[PDB]
Paper text:
FUS (FUsed in Sarcoma) is a 54 kDa RNA-binding protein with multiple functions, including roles in the regulation of transcription through interactions with the C-terminal domain of RNA polymerase II8,9, in RNA splicing through multimeric binding to long introns, in DNA damage repair, in cellular responses to stress, and in mRNA transport and subcellular localization of translation. The N-terminal half is an LC domain comprised primarily of Ser, Gly, Gln, Tyr, Thr, and Pro residues, and with no Leu, Ile, Val, or Phe residues. Although the LC domain of FUS is largely unstructured as a monomer in solution, the LC domain is essential for normal FUS functions, including shuttling between the nucleus and cytoplasm, DNA damage repair, and transcription regulation.
Residues 123–134 adopt an irregular conformation that allows the protein chain to fold back on itself. Thus, burial of Gln side chains appears to be a factor that determines the core structure. The absence of charged amino acid side chains and the absence of purely hydrophobic residues other than Pro within the FUS-LC-C fibril core implies that hydrophobic interactions and salt bridges do not account for the formation of FUS-LC-C fibrils.
Residue numbers in the entry:
A (entry chain 1), B (entry chain 2), C (entry chain 3), D (entry chain 4), E (entry chain 5), F (entry chain 6), ...: 2 to 40
The structure:
Protein backbone atom coordinates (compact mmCIF):
# COMPACT_ATOMS: atom_id res chain seq x y z
CA UNK A 1 0.00 0.00 0.00
CA UNK A 2 2.61 2.54 -1.09
CA UNK A 3 3.96 4.48 -4.05
CA UNK A 4 7.55 5.45 -4.82
CA UNK A 5 9.46 7.39 -7.47
CA UNK A 6 13.08 8.36 -8.04
CA UNK A 7 15.03 10.41 -10.57
CA UNK A 8 18.79 10.60 -11.11
CA UNK A 9 20.76 12.90 -13.41
CA UNK A 10 24.50 13.44 -13.87
CA UNK A 11 26.93 15.37 -16.06
CA UNK A 12 30.62 14.64 -16.74
CA UNK A 13 33.20 17.38 -17.41
CA UNK A 14 30.74 19.67 -19.29
CA UNK A 15 31.80 22.83 -21.17
CA UNK A 16 35.47 22.09 -21.92
CA UNK A 17 35.66 23.45 -25.50
CA UNK A 18 37.57 26.63 -26.35
CA UNK A 19 36.75 29.75 -28.39
CA UNK A 20 33.00 29.10 -28.51
CA UNK A 21 29.59 29.88 -27.03
CA UNK A 22 28.66 27.26 -24.46
CA UNK A 23 25.66 28.53 -22.46
CA UNK A 24 23.95 26.01 -20.16
CA UNK A 25 20.32 25.98 -19.01
CA UNK A 26 18.76 23.45 -16.63
CA UNK A 27 15.51 21.66 -17.53
CA UNK A 28 12.38 20.56 -15.63
CA UNK A 29 11.84 17.44 -13.51
CA UNK A 30 8.71 16.31 -11.64
CA UNK A 31 8.51 13.32 -9.32
CA UNK A 32 5.27 12.07 -7.80
CA UNK A 33 5.20 9.44 -5.05
CA UNK A 34 1.93 8.97 -3.20
CA UNK A 35 -0.77 6.65 -1.92
CA UNK A 36 -4.45 7.62 -2.08
CA UNK A 37 -7.58 6.01 -0.67
CA UNK A 38 -11.27 6.95 -0.77
CA UNK A 39 -13.65 5.86 1.98
CA UNK B 1 0.19 3.37 3.58
CA UNK B 2 2.91 5.80 2.54
CA UNK B 3 4.40 7.70 -0.39
CA UNK B 4 8.03 8.55 -1.08
CA UNK B 5 10.05 10.42 -3.69
CA UNK B 6 13.72 11.26 -4.19
CA UNK B 7 15.79 13.24 -6.68
CA UNK B 8 19.57 13.30 -7.14
CA UNK B 9 21.66 15.53 -9.40
CA UNK B 10 25.43 15.94 -9.78
CA UNK B 11 27.98 17.78 -11.93
CA UNK B 12 31.64 16.93 -12.52
CA UNK B 13 34.33 19.57 -13.14
CA UNK B 14 31.99 21.94 -15.08
CA UNK B 15 33.19 25.06 -16.94
CA UNK B 16 36.85 24.19 -17.61
CA UNK B 17 37.17 25.52 -21.20
CA UNK B 18 39.20 28.64 -22.02
CA UNK B 19 38.53 31.78 -24.07
CA UNK B 20 34.77 31.25 -24.27
CA UNK B 21 31.36 32.15 -22.87
CA UNK B 22 30.28 29.58 -20.31
CA UNK B 23 27.28 30.96 -18.39
CA UNK B 24 25.44 28.50 -16.12
CA UNK B 25 21.79 28.60 -15.05
CA UNK B 26 20.09 26.12 -12.70
CA UNK B 27 16.80 24.44 -13.66
CA UNK B 28 13.59 23.46 -11.83
CA UNK B 29 12.91 20.36 -9.71
CA UNK B 30 9.70 19.34 -7.90
CA UNK B 31 9.34 16.37 -5.59
CA UNK B 32 6.03 15.23 -4.13
CA UNK B 33 5.82 12.62 -1.38
CA UNK B 34 2.49 12.26 0.40
CA UNK B 35 -0.31 10.03 1.62
CA UNK B 36 -3.95 11.13 1.38
CA UNK B 37 -7.16 9.63 2.73
CA UNK B 38 -10.81 10.69 2.54
CA UNK B 39 -13.29 9.69 5.24
CA UNK C 1 0.43 6.73 7.17
CA UNK C 2 3.24 9.08 6.17
CA UNK C 3 4.86 10.91 3.28
CA UNK C 4 8.53 11.65 2.66
CA UNK C 5 10.66 13.44 0.09
CA UNK C 6 14.37 14.16 -0.33
CA UNK C 7 16.55 16.07 -2.79
CA UNK C 8 20.34 16.01 -3.16
CA UNK C 9 22.55 18.16 -5.39
CA UNK C 10 26.34 18.44 -5.68
CA UNK C 11 28.98 20.20 -7.78
CA UNK C 12 32.64 19.23 -8.28
CA UNK C 13 35.41 21.78 -8.86
CA UNK C 14 33.19 24.22 -10.86
CA UNK C 15 34.54 27.29 -12.70
CA UNK C 16 38.18 26.31 -13.29
CA UNK C 17 38.61 27.61 -16.87
CA UNK C 18 40.76 30.66 -17.66
CA UNK C 19 40.23 33.82 -19.74
CA UNK C 20 36.46 33.40 -20.01
CA UNK C 21 33.05 34.41 -18.69
CA UNK C 22 31.84 31.89 -16.14
CA UNK C 23 28.84 33.37 -14.29
CA UNK C 24 26.88 30.98 -12.07
CA UNK C 25 23.21 31.20 -11.07
CA UNK C 26 21.38 28.79 -8.74
CA UNK C 27 18.06 27.20 -9.78
CA UNK C 28 14.78 26.32 -8.01
CA UNK C 29 13.96 23.26 -5.89
CA UNK C 30 10.68 22.35 -4.15
CA UNK C 31 10.18 19.40 -1.84
CA UNK C 32 6.80 18.37 -0.45
CA UNK C 33 6.46 15.78 2.31
CA UNK C 34 3.07 15.53 4.01
CA UNK C 35 0.18 13.40 5.18
CA UNK C 36 -3.41 14.61 4.85
CA UNK C 37 -6.70 13.22 6.14
CA UNK C 38 -10.31 14.39 5.87
CA UNK C 39 -12.88 13.48 8.52
CA UNK D 1 0.66 10.12 10.73
CA UNK D 2 3.57 12.37 9.80
CA UNK D 3 5.32 14.14 6.93
CA UNK D 4 9.03 14.76 6.40
CA UNK D 5 11.28 16.46 3.87
CA UNK D 6 15.01 17.07 3.53
CA UNK D 7 17.31 18.88 1.11
CA UNK D 8 21.10 18.69 0.82
CA UNK D 9 23.43 20.76 -1.36
CA UNK D 10 27.23 20.92 -1.57
CA UNK D 11 29.98 22.57 -3.61
CA UNK D 12 33.61 21.48 -4.03
CA UNK D 13 36.49 23.94 -4.55
CA UNK D 14 34.39 26.44 -6.61
CA UNK D 15 35.87 29.46 -8.43
CA UNK D 16 39.50 28.36 -8.93
CA UNK D 17 40.05 29.63 -12.51
CA UNK D 18 42.32 32.61 -13.26
CA UNK D 19 41.95 35.78 -15.35
CA UNK D 20 38.18 35.47 -15.71
CA UNK D 21 34.77 36.61 -14.47
CA UNK D 22 33.41 34.13 -11.95
CA UNK D 23 30.43 35.72 -10.17
CA UNK D 24 28.33 33.40 -7.98
CA UNK D 25 24.65 33.75 -7.06
CA UNK D 26 22.69 31.41 -4.77
CA UNK D 27 19.34 29.94 -5.87
CA UNK D 28 16.00 29.18 -4.18
CA UNK D 29 15.03 26.15 -2.07
CA UNK D 30 11.69 25.35 -0.41
CA UNK D 31 11.04 22.43 1.91
CA UNK D 32 7.60 21.52 3.22
CA UNK D 33 7.10 18.96 5.98
CA UNK D 34 3.68 18.81 7.61
CA UNK D 35 0.69 16.78 8.72
CA UNK D 36 -2.86 18.12 8.31
CA UNK D 37 -6.22 16.84 9.51
CA UNK D 38 -9.78 18.13 9.16
CA UNK D 39 -12.44 17.32 11.76
CA UNK E 1 15.22 37.76 -38.74
CA UNK E 2 13.35 36.85 -35.56
CA UNK E 3 11.69 34.01 -33.67
CA UNK E 4 8.59 34.09 -31.49
CA UNK E 5 6.58 31.70 -29.34
CA UNK E 6 3.50 31.97 -27.12
CA UNK E 7 1.53 29.66 -24.84
CA UNK E 8 -1.89 30.21 -23.27
CA UNK E 9 -3.73 28.06 -20.72
CA UNK E 10 -6.99 28.58 -18.84
CA UNK E 11 -9.31 26.77 -16.43
CA UNK E 12 -13.00 27.41 -15.74
CA UNK E 13 -14.63 26.82 -12.34
CA UNK E 14 -12.44 23.77 -11.47
CA UNK E 15 -13.04 21.52 -8.44
CA UNK E 16 -16.76 22.09 -7.79
CA UNK E 17 -17.82 18.49 -6.97
CA UNK E 18 -18.78 17.42 -3.44
CA UNK E 19 -17.81 14.49 -1.20
CA UNK E 20 -14.79 13.46 -3.27
CA UNK E 21 -11.02 13.63 -3.69
CA UNK E 22 -10.09 16.41 -6.08
CA UNK E 23 -6.33 17.05 -5.83
CA UNK E 24 -4.80 19.33 -8.47
CA UNK E 25 -1.22 19.34 -9.76
CA UNK E 26 0.21 21.74 -12.35
CA UNK E 27 2.15 20.44 -15.37
CA UNK E 28 5.23 21.56 -17.33
CA UNK E 29 5.48 24.19 -20.09
CA UNK E 30 8.54 25.30 -22.09
CA UNK E 31 8.61 28.15 -24.57
CA UNK E 32 11.60 28.94 -26.77
CA UNK E 33 11.83 32.14 -28.81
CA UNK E 34 15.22 33.02 -30.26
CA UNK E 35 17.30 34.02 -33.25
CA UNK E 36 20.77 32.55 -33.82
CA UNK E 37 23.52 33.35 -36.31
CA UNK E 38 26.99 31.94 -36.92
CA UNK E 39 29.74 34.07 -38.46
CA UNK F 1 17.44 40.22 -35.11
CA UNK F 2 15.46 39.41 -31.97
CA UNK F 3 13.69 36.66 -30.06
CA UNK F 4 10.54 36.85 -27.96
CA UNK F 5 8.41 34.54 -25.83
CA UNK F 6 5.29 34.93 -23.70
CA UNK F 7 3.20 32.72 -21.43
CA UNK F 8 -0.25 33.38 -19.96
CA UNK F 9 -2.20 31.32 -17.42
CA UNK F 10 -5.50 31.96 -15.64
CA UNK F 11 -7.92 30.24 -13.26
CA UNK F 12 -11.61 30.99 -12.68
CA UNK F 13 -13.34 30.49 -9.32
CA UNK F 14 -11.25 27.41 -8.34
CA UNK F 15 -12.00 25.22 -5.28
CA UNK F 16 -15.71 25.90 -4.74
CA UNK F 17 -16.88 22.34 -3.89
CA UNK F 18 -17.96 21.35 -0.37
CA UNK F 19 -17.13 18.44 1.95
CA UNK F 20 -14.08 17.31 -0.03
CA UNK F 21 -10.30 17.37 -0.36
CA UNK F 22 -9.24 20.09 -2.77
CA UNK F 23 -5.47 20.62 -2.42
CA UNK F 24 -3.82 22.82 -5.07
CA UNK F 25 -0.20 22.72 -6.26
CA UNK F 26 1.35 25.04 -8.86
CA UNK F 27 3.34 23.64 -11.80
CA UNK F 28 6.49 24.65 -13.70
CA UNK F 29 6.88 27.22 -16.49
CA UNK F 30 10.03 28.21 -18.43
CA UNK F 31 10.23 31.03 -20.96
CA UNK F 32 13.30 31.70 -23.08
CA UNK F 33 13.66 34.87 -25.16
CA UNK F 34 17.10 35.62 -26.55
CA UNK F 35 19.29 36.52 -29.50
CA UNK F 36 22.73 34.95 -29.96
CA UNK F 37 25.55 35.66 -32.39
CA UNK F 38 29.01 34.14 -32.88
CA UNK F 39 31.84 36.17 -34.39
CA UNK G 1 19.63 42.69 -31.43
CA UNK G 2 17.55 41.98 -28.34
CA UNK G 3 15.66 39.30 -26.44
CA UNK G 4 12.47 39.61 -24.42
CA UNK G 5 10.23 37.39 -22.31
CA UNK G 6 7.06 37.89 -20.26
CA UNK G 7 4.86 35.76 -18.01
CA UNK G 8 1.40 36.53 -16.64
CA UNK G 9 -0.67 34.57 -14.12
CA UNK G 10 -3.99 35.32 -12.43
CA UNK G 11 -6.52 33.70 -10.09
CA UNK G 12 -10.21 34.55 -9.62
CA UNK G 13 -12.03 34.16 -6.29
CA UNK G 14 -10.05 31.04 -5.21
CA UNK G 15 -10.92 28.92 -2.14
CA UNK G 16 -14.63 29.70 -1.70
CA UNK G 17 -15.91 26.19 -0.83
CA UNK G 18 -17.10 25.29 2.68
CA UNK G 19 -16.40 22.39 5.07
CA UNK G 20 -13.34 21.15 3.18
CA UNK G 21 -9.55 21.11 2.95
CA UNK G 22 -8.36 23.76 0.53
CA UNK G 23 -4.59 24.21 0.96
CA UNK G 24 -2.82 26.31 -1.68
CA UNK G 25 0.83 26.10 -2.78
CA UNK G 26 2.51 28.35 -5.37
CA UNK G 27 4.52 26.84 -8.24
CA UNK G 28 7.75 27.74 -10.07
CA UNK G 29 8.28 30.26 -12.90
CA UNK G 30 11.49 31.14 -14.77
CA UNK G 31 11.83 33.91 -17.33
CA UNK G 32 14.97 34.47 -19.39
CA UNK G 33 15.46 37.59 -21.51
CA UNK G 34 18.96 38.24 -22.83
CA UNK G 35 21.24 39.04 -25.73
CA UNK G 36 24.65 37.37 -26.07
CA UNK G 37 27.55 37.96 -28.45
CA UNK G 38 30.98 36.35 -28.82
CA UNK G 39 33.90 38.28 -30.29
CA UNK H 1 21.81 45.14 -27.77
CA UNK H 2 19.63 44.54 -24.71
CA UNK H 3 17.62 41.95 -22.81
CA UNK H 4 14.38 42.37 -20.88
CA UNK H 5 12.04 40.24 -18.79
CA UNK H 6 8.84 40.86 -16.83
CA UNK H 7 6.52 38.83 -14.61
CA UNK H 8 3.04 39.71 -13.35
CA UNK H 9 0.86 37.84 -10.85
CA UNK H 10 -2.48 38.71 -9.26
CA UNK H 11 -5.11 37.20 -6.96
CA UNK H 12 -8.78 38.15 -6.60
CA UNK H 13 -10.70 37.86 -3.30
CA UNK H 14 -8.83 34.71 -2.12
CA UNK H 15 -9.84 32.67 0.95
CA UNK H 16 -13.54 33.55 1.28
CA UNK H 17 -14.93 30.09 2.17
CA UNK H 18 -16.23 29.28 5.67
CA UNK H 19 -15.66 26.41 8.13
CA UNK H 20 -12.59 25.07 6.33
CA UNK H 21 -8.80 24.92 6.20
CA UNK H 22 -7.48 27.49 3.77
CA UNK H 23 -3.71 27.84 4.29
CA UNK H 24 -1.82 29.86 1.67
CA UNK H 25 1.85 29.54 0.67
CA UNK H 26 3.65 31.69 -1.91
CA UNK H 27 5.70 30.09 -4.71
CA UNK H 28 9.00 30.88 -6.47
CA UNK H 29 9.66 33.33 -9.32
CA UNK H 30 12.94 34.10 -11.12
CA UNK H 31 13.42 36.81 -13.72
CA UNK H 32 16.62 37.25 -15.71
CA UNK H 33 17.25 40.32 -17.86
CA UNK H 34 20.79 40.87 -19.10
CA UNK H 35 23.17 41.55 -21.96
CA UNK H 36 26.54 39.79 -22.18
CA UNK H 37 29.51 40.26 -24.49
CA UNK H 38 32.91 38.56 -24.75
CA UNK H 39 35.92 40.39 -26.17
Amino acid sequence: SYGSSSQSSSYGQPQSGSYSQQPSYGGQQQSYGQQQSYN
